[PDB]
Amino acid sequence: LSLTADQMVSALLDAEPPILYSESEASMMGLLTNLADRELVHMINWAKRVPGFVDLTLHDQVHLLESAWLEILMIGLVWRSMEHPGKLLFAPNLLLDRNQGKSVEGMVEIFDMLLATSSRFRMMNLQGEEFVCLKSIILLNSGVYTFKDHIHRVLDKITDTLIHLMAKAGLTLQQQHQRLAQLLLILSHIRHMSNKGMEHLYSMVVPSYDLLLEMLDAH
Amino acid sequence: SLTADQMVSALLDAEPPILYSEYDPTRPFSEASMMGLLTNLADRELVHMINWAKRVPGFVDLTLHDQVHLLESAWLEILMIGLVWRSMEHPGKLLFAPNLLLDRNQGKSVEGMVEIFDMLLATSSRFRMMNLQGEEFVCLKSIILLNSGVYTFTLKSLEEKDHIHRVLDKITDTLIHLMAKAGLTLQQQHQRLAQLLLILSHIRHMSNKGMEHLYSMKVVPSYDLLLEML
Ligand SMILES: C[C@@H]1CCCN1CCOc1ccc([C@@H]2c3ccc(O)cc3CC3(CC3)N2C(=O)c2ccccc2)cc1
Ligand SMILES: C[C@@H]1CCCN1CCOc1ccc([C@@H]2c3ccc(O)cc3CC3(CC3)N2C(=O)c2ccccc2)cc1
């Protein structure tokens, strides 16, 4: 928690996970599940480098990941897809349009929510520095109300860093707090998407505690 | 055109009343009748919710279709935050009505009910830990009304989404103003703004899980109902 805002941004940029590649309608769902399964491991490695995360007990680290993992997968998809209007870039070799998501019942409703988030990011010209902060807030915030001071300390630190990023970009104080608010209000829609996404996945899948624990690779 | 103080005044004057459950000293409380009472209460609350929304500055500038879509997306979240607010001064309890005050042991009678009850209690506890102020509450409720449905909506649509973000920006200015007036540094102002807006994610999560629970008993106010009221 002693890092400067610049050191925080640099830490988070450095921790970014790699973009993974993909392995008919039937094959489409299998490719998407296999991709998500392989990304999860890299998400766990990313989480361990979010300043302050590894200060939590392993139990609490797992609970946070249980709560945030689908939200983190979607905000990364939305980020990857931001410069591909009307499409979603699941992988460099798996670019899909909404028309491909019509074969499965209830798939296109989420496809559209994801596209709308990408359009919102495009409208706001979301910067990579702001995205890695938002993704860190999702990790620390999503499970906090379902288990504390340390989590809120880290969250306050990320808030400071987001403000610092905006003042550094020349925003007035008013524009700083309006942009902060706008970014955080997107997190409510990402929670909504994650909830509707879970319902859809169950309509056809949660990582177990032991699985997340093992990937954390305790020492 | 409103100032921050003017925005606070409008939102405070728009606040709906606290409604009651039925009184009958000959009728002891029973858990078999609890869901009927809560449904009756929520249905009455929805009517006042419509007339509150029409007084949230900028809300009636939208088309009726988009007013309905926003209410469709936010109505349960608004009932839930109202419940949480009413319960804030009553640890361990949910104050559905002043004469309908329940603890979690009374929320175990129905499957999946205690989980949502546990979440509502935790949000109430969070409101206390922050010493959430009434002026801040009505701003948060307004943000839910304008924000919940805006990512799920043509040239008219672009104009109304622009309007909605302009009203949301003014409520942000108002929240900050209230925090500066209370004597917080800017660091504390930014940090508190963030803490408040992050609670809205949990309120959305609760709304989703509560929808699932409502459909599990077998629910939504129809478009024509909401339109007629609006
Ligand atoms: C990972 C867990 C652990 C235990 C087993 N689980 C495996 C199943 O969960 C998952 C998780 C995610 C997806 C994909 C996937 C993959 C990669 C990505 O970056 C993002 C996504 C996004 C996502 C929406 C959520 N999705 C879909 O298909 C989808 C997209 C659009 C509309 C409807 C649906 C598939 C399956
Ligand atoms: C309004 C719709 C439109 C068309 C018909 N109505 C349909 C009924 O939907 C409703 C809506 C809300 C509730 C209550 C109710 C009432 C008042 C309140 O202030 C708040 C709440 C909170 C709420 C959780 C959401 N709830 C429950 O019972 C509950 C609480 C705890 C755990 C599990 C369940 C009942 C029924």
Curated annotation (Swiss-Prot), chain A:
GO terms for biological process, alphabetical: androgen metabolic process; antral ovarian follicle growth; cellular response to estradiol stimulus; cellular response to estrogen stimulus; chromatin remodeling; epithelial cell development; epithelial cell proliferation involved in mammary gland duct elongation; estrogen receptor signaling pathway
Effect caused by changing residue 86 to V: Destabilizes the receptor and decreases its affinity for estradiol at 25 degrees Celsius, but not at 4 degrees Celsius
Cellular compartments per GO CC: chromatin; cytoplasm; cytosol; euchromatin; Golgi apparatus; membrane; nucleoplasm; nucleus
Region span, Interaction with AKAP13: 1-219
Region (Transactivation AF-2) residue spans: 4-219
Modified residues (Phosphotyrosine): 209
Record note on modification: Phosphorylated by cyclin A/CDK2 and CK1. Phosphorylation probably enhances transcriptional activity. Self-association induces phosphorylation. Phosphorylated by LMTK3 in vitro.
Compartment(s) of residence: Nucleus; Golgi apparatus; Cell membrane
Recorded GO MF terms: 14-3-3 protein binding; ATPase binding; beta-catenin binding; calmodulin binding; chromatin binding; DNA-binding transcription activator activity, RNA polymerase II-specific; DNA-binding transcription factor activity; DNA-binding transcription factor activity, RNA polymerase II-specific
Region (Self-association): 1-219
Top-rank lineage group of the source organism: Eukaryota
Keyword vocabulary terms for this entry: Activator, Cell membrane, Cytoplasm, Disease variant, DNA-binding, Glycoprotein, Golgi apparatus, Lipid-binding, Lipoprotein, Membrane, Metal-binding, Methylation, Nucleus, Osteoporosis, Palmitate, Phosphoprotein, Receptor, Steroid-binding, Transcription, Transcription regulation, Transmembrane, Ubl conjugation, Zinc, Zinc-finger
Lipidation (S-palmitoyl cysteine): 133
Keyword Magnesium (UniProt): no
Tissue: Widely expressed. Not expressed in the pituitary gland.
Residue ranges constituting the NR LBD domain according to the UniProt record: 4-219
Residues at which 17beta-estradiol binds: 39, 80, 200
Domain remark from Swiss-Prot or TrEMBL: Composed of three domains: a modulating N-terminal domain, a DNA-binding domain and a C-terminal ligand-binding domain. The modulating domain, also known as A/B or AF-1 domain has a ligand-independent transactivation function. The C-terminus contains a ligand-dependent transactivation domain, also known as E/F or AF-2 domain which overlaps with the ligand binding domain. AF-1 and AF-2 activate transcription independently and synergistically and act in a promoter- and cell-specific manner. AF-1 seems to provide the major transactivation function in differentiated cells.
Sequence similarity: Belongs to the nuclear hormone receptor family. NR3 subfamily.
Other noteworthy facts: Selective estrogen receptor modulators (SERMs), such as tamoxifen, raloxifene, toremifene, lasofoxifene, clomifene, femarelle and ormeloxifene, have tissue selective agonistic and antagonistic effects on the estrogen receptor (ER). They interfere with the ER association with coactivators or corepressors, mainly involving the AF-2 domain.
Protein known as: Estrogen receptor
Natural source organism: Homo sapiens (Human)
Part of the full-length chain shown: 308 to 547 of 595
UniProtKB/Swiss-Prot annotation, chain B:
Residue positions binding 17beta-estradiol: 45, 86, 213
Modified how: Phosphorylated by cyclin A/CDK2 and CK1. Phosphorylation probably enhances transcriptional activity. Self-association induces phosphorylation. Phosphorylated by LMTK3 in vitro. Glycosylated; contains N-acetylglucosamine, probably O-linked.
Top-rank lineage group of the source organism: Eukaryota
GO cellular component assignments: chromatin; cytoplasm; cytosol; euchromatin; Golgi apparatus; membrane; nucleoplasm; nucleus
Keyword Disulfide bond appears in the UniProt entry: no
Outcome following mutation: residue 67 to H: In ESTRR; results in highly reduced activity
Main location as per UniProt: nucleus
GO BP term, pick one: uterus development
Name of the protein in question: Estrogen receptor
The species this protein was found in: Homo sapiens
Gene designation: ESR1
Residues of the full protein shown: 309 to 544 of 595
